Amino acid sequence: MSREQIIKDGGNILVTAGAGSGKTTILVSKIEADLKENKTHYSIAAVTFTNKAAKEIEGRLGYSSRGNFIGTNDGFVESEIIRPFIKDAFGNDYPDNFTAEYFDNQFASYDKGLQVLKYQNILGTYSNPKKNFKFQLALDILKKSLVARQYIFSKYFKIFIDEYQDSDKDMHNLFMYLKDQLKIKLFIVGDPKQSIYIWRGAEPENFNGLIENSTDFNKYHLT
């Protein structure tokens, strides 16, 4: 019975779920179980691109005194990692409050993007649709700031990751940095057949390699 396997969990869990949602109910069950068995100040982070998915996750879940974050990956980063520590990591000159618009710069060189971000306050994306600069900035702010690393270590003990096939190398590197260099548990679920956002920038080959090459993430089959 797969319910016993779901309940017994244990460390990192990878589930090969099917299409037609399905991942939502196991995600909710895992979140509720982790909140119930926990008895410390450690929080949880569940991230999903779909806004209405975040709305329903918040609606079906009750009020938690300890801060549990529900939102999108870019919103998650720009909310807790970029916004507070941008002044601490890169000096008081860098702005703290800003809005993200992808269709402003459309640059070709990383140095030009760095200059326009530093001076004109404008934050956009590469001309190449692949990769997201926000997660590279998150890596940069994490690398040279011990405060950000300490906050991420202490706040979340297990970060829940959804629709990981949509992830590119940047947030993949961010999540691996949090898992390895910060020893933070990761709960990742992904559908191998959901490779439809490739044009949007998704490159799931790293996820498939982790499925095959990596050994820490045990593979589970759900009916």
Q: Which residues are near another protein by CB under 8 A? A: 40-43, 62-67, 80, 83-85, 87-89, 144-147, 150-151, 153-155
Of these, 67, 95, 129, 209, which contacts a copy of itself (CB under 8 A)?
95
46, 63 in Cβ contact below 8 A? Answer: no
Q: Is 79 in the site for a copy of itself (CB under 8 A)?
A: no
Spatial distance between the Cα atoms of 188 and 46, rounded to a whole number of angstroms: 10
Residue 198's binding partner out of a copy of itself, another protein, none, with CB under 5 to 8 Å set by partner kind: none
Spatial distance between the Cα atoms of 12 and 132, rounded to a whole number of angstroms: 26
Region from 93-101, 107-115, 129-137, 212-220 binding a copy of itself, contact rule CB under 8 A = 93-101
Spatial distance between the Cα atoms of 135 and 151, rounded to a whole number of angstroms: 17
Residue 11's binding partner out of another protein, a copy of itself, none, with CB under 5 to 8 Å set by partner kind: none
**Tokens standing for residue 99:** 């809005």
Spatial distance between the Cα atoms of 167 and 77, rounded to a whole number of angstroms: 14
* 22 assigned ligand-binding residue: yes
157, 185 in Cβ contact below 8 A? Answer: yes
Region from 66-74, 95-103, 107-115, 174-182 binding a copy of itself, contact rule CB under 8 A = 95-103
Toward another protein, which CB reaches closer, 53 or 89?
89
**Tokens standing for residue 5:** 């396997």
In the three-class reduction of DSSP (H, G, I as helix; E, B as strand; rest coil), residue 162 is classed as: coil
Residue 90: CB minimum distance to a copy of itself, A: 15
* 19 assigned ligand-binding residue: yes
